Amino acid sequence: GKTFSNVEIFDPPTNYRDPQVLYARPLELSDGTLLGTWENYSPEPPNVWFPIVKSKDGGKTWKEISKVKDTQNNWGLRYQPQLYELPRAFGKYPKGTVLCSGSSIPSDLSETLIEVYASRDKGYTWEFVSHVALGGEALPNPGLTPVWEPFLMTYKEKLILYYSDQRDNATHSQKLVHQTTTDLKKWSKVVDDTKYANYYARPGMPTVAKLPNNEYIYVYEYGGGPNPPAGSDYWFPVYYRLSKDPQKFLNKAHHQIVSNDGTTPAGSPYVVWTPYGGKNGTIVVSCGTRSEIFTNQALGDASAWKKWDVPQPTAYTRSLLTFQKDPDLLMIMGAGILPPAGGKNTVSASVVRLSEVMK
Ligand SMILES: OC[C@@H]1O[C@@H](OC[C@@H]2NC[C@H](O)[C@H]2O)[C@H](O)[C@H]1O
Ligand SMILES: [Mn+2]
Ligand SMILES: [Mn+2]
Ligand SMILES: [Mn+2]
Ligand SMILES: [Mn+2]
Ligand SMILES: [Mn+2]
Numbered sequence: 001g002k003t004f005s006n007v008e009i010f011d012p013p014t015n016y017r018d019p020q021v022l023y024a025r026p027l028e029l030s031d032g033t034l035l036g037t038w039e040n041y042s043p044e045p046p047n048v049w050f051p052i053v054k055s056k057d058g059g060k061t062w063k064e065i066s067k068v069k070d071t072q073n074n075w076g077l078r079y080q081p082q083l084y085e086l087p088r089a090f091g092k093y094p095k096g097t098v099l100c101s102g103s104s105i106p107s108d109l110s111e112t113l114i115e116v117y118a119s120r121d122k123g124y125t126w127e128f129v130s131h132v133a134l135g136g137e138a139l140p141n142p143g144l145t146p147v148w149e150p151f152l153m154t155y156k157e158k159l160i161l162y163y164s165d166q167r168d169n170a171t172h173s174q175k176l177v178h179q180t181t182t183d184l185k186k187w188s189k190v191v192d193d194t195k196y197a198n199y200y201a202r203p204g205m206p207t208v209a210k211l212p213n214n215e216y217i218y219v220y221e222y223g224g225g226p227n228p229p230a231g232s233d234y235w236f237p238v239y240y241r242l243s244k245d246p247q248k249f250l251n252k253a254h255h256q257i258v259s260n261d262g263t264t265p266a267g268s269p270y271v272v273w274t275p276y277g278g279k280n281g282t283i284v285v286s287c288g289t290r291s292e293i294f295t296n297q298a299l300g301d302a303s304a305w306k307k308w309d310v311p312q313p314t315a316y317t318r319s320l321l322t323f324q325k326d327p328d329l330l331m332i333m334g335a336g337i338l339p340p341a342g343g344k345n346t347v348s349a350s351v352v353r354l355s356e357v358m359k
Contacts, residue, residue: 002058002329003351005311009036009053009062009333010347017041021345024335026059026321027083030096034059034321035123037068037081037100038335038347044107047076050100052123058323059331059351068100068117068126077115078105079138084152090159091183098123101132101150101161109138112146114163116184130185135167142173142200153208155246158182162193162206162218174202176220178247193218193249194241200224204236205317208246209273212281216246217300219271219285225256229264238265238287242300257285257294259307265294268317276327276354284330284354288316293332295358308357312350328353 012020023039034055042048050068055061070077081102088095098119103112112135117126136145148164158180165177175195179187194203202223209217221236228235241252257265268288275281283296285305291314298304312318315334323329330352336345 002326003353004060005350006313006348007060007350008346008348010038010051012041012345014343015043017043018343019336019339019341019345020343021335021347022338023080023317024315024333024347024349025081025083025319026331026333026349027085027098028321028324029085029098029122030324031122032325033122034331035083035098036062036333036347036349037083039079039081044076047074048078050077050081050102052100054123059349066119066124066126068102070104070115071128072115072131073104073106073113075104075106075113077102077117079103079112080149082150082152087154090181091185093118093120093129093184096122099129099152100126101152103138103148103150105138111136112138112148114147114150114161116161118184130187132161132179132187133163133165133190135165140174140202143169145169149205151207153210153246159184160246161187162208164204164206165190168195171199172196173200174204174223176203176206180247191247191250194220194254195250196224198224203239205268207269207271209271209283211273211283211299212275212279213299215242215244215299217242217271217273217283218246218249219269221267221269222254222256236267238267238269238285240271240300255300255302257305258302259294259305261307263290263292263307265290270317270319272320272322272330274322274327274330274354276322277358281327282354284320284322286318286320286332288314288318290314293330293357295354306358310350310352310357312348328355330354330357
């Protein structure tokens, strides 16, 4: 069988710094290998690194094969890792190169620097490729200037790196932006993806999926979004936008995700699309405050979101992966909750079938 529930990937040493682990990310390579990583809050020195685990049995068993280290700044690779496999060449990096992007940050949290590292051997070694975006102090506070949370996706001849940006600090507490590259070395001018006139709004945490009608869905948490629930003055509801050109989300209408029973997912979302489920396939969304998955088999029609229980627990920026050879299979991967985590975070995953979950 290919399904499983709550398989532990990593349990941190107990002296790791709260939250110990956070921010799990998976990747399927073209050969069917899975890689995984997370924020690893080790005692420093040595400077923090992103661990790389590998599974050859679809996620049932794992072992660490390498570490992505900061070779440039003597700071560490600290926050918000993201794994991605090149589907075509970009300059001297061929199809099948594995990228790991993430934020290099000194221990004192005084600066943020989104980096790209690359592996030419399917995750065993790593090379620094380029600096993408420099920002200020790594606290999510209005008026500071950090950058955060890279997400990578190819569009035609460009590679796009989407992220969260506090550098327009007199006009937007945070906004969402991207840069593009054709050689992985030279990055374009910053392009705005989503921003709000209310200074205190904090759209954040962008992920993107391609739909079979040639549109793309862009998903984010809308910090400061309307209608906070009772006893809250500020919340992070999951919103999305749809676009044929994934460089042009800024001008598209926004949509809150609300399931048929009225459930309003909030926090640190993650989107994928699978061909499973008919001609429109199935859009699958997780959020970081509930355990259910949210699905849409109507190309993002705002009236068509459904909610389903799964065995994997609630986690901050819980992530998703669809399997190339069986679109019915869905991996759900997490690394626990925001600090204070009480020593209890672990990295774990489940693999479910949508054909079974969606009843
Ligand atoms: O990943 C570690 C985490 O990052 C910091 O939060 C960043 C904010 N998350 C939502 C917004 O998009 C961004 O400002 C936090 O301090 C750490 O725990
Ligand atoms: Mn243990
Ligand atoms: Mn433990
Ligand atoms: Mn593949
Ligand atoms: Mn439920
Ligand atoms: Mn079964």
